[PDB]
């Protein structure tokens, strides 16, 4: 709650005001970014979704490019900590990366929990005429957006988690079933080449460089 209020709340605007920066030294930096690196290093496995879920809530309700980039930096610093996490192992990194890239990982935001009621059946009687119409807000109505808006950021995070794991020799051929787990990744990284997002393709190409050495 404290960290997200700094980065995405009303406090983030005060970081740009020069009058505040001159008077207050602590306003000159945003240290919430560095704390996410510490949190990613020393978090339990079961607490990963709790760390990630508020981020996906913000992305679904934003149409601003500036706010989307701040979530991107937030996700990147969490993954840096996760690579050097002791409870994070080669099996969990592969399992987490696959869920993020394939989007099978269940995040289950609030909107999916309570979908809107369907439109009334025209054969059935209409609703009562005593019901007041919704009041219109000043300055126009809200515009509809796609359901899969800004969700490529989560796919990019899975590719970055895999890419840095391979480069730092966290993933090694010897032992247990790493070769078994790395095998389905070949087909998954192939389909990412056809993605509409450029950064998804770039991430898959970087990962494909190392996985073709196995």
């Amino acid at each position: 709650e404290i960290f997200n209020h700094e980065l995405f709340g009303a406090v983030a605007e005060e970081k740009e005001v020069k009058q505040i920066l001159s008077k207050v030294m602590e306003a000159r930096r945003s240290k919430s970014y560095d704390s996410y690196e510490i949190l990613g290093k020393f978090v339990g496995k079961d607490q990963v979704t709790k760390l990630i879920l508020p981020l996906k809530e913000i992305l679904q309700n934003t149409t601003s490019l500036k706010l989307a980039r701040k979530v991107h930096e937030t996700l990147r610093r969490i993954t840096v900590g996760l690579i050097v996490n002791q409870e994070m192992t080669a099996e969990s990194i592969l399992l987490l990366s696959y869920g993020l890239i394939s989007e099978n990982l269940p995040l289950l935001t609030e909107k999916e929990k309570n979908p809107v009621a369907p439109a009334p059946d025209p054969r059935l009687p209409p609703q009562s005429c005593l019901l007041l119409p919704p009041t219109p807000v000043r300055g126009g109505q809200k515009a509809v957006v796609s359901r899969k808006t800004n969700m490529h950021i989560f796919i990019e995070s899975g590719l970055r988690l895999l890419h840095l794991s391979l480069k730092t020799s966290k993933i090694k051929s010897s032992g247990e079933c790493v070769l078994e787990m790395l095998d389905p990744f070949v087909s998954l990284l192939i389909d990412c080449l056809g993605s509409m997002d450029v950064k998804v393709i770039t991430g898959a190409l970087q990962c494909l460089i190392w996985v073709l050495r196995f």
Partner: peptide
Amino acid sequence: EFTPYDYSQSDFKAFAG
């Protein structure tokens, strides 16, 4: 023999409380 890991049965419950 080589049998790749089956991700279709991944519950992902280890990452949630």
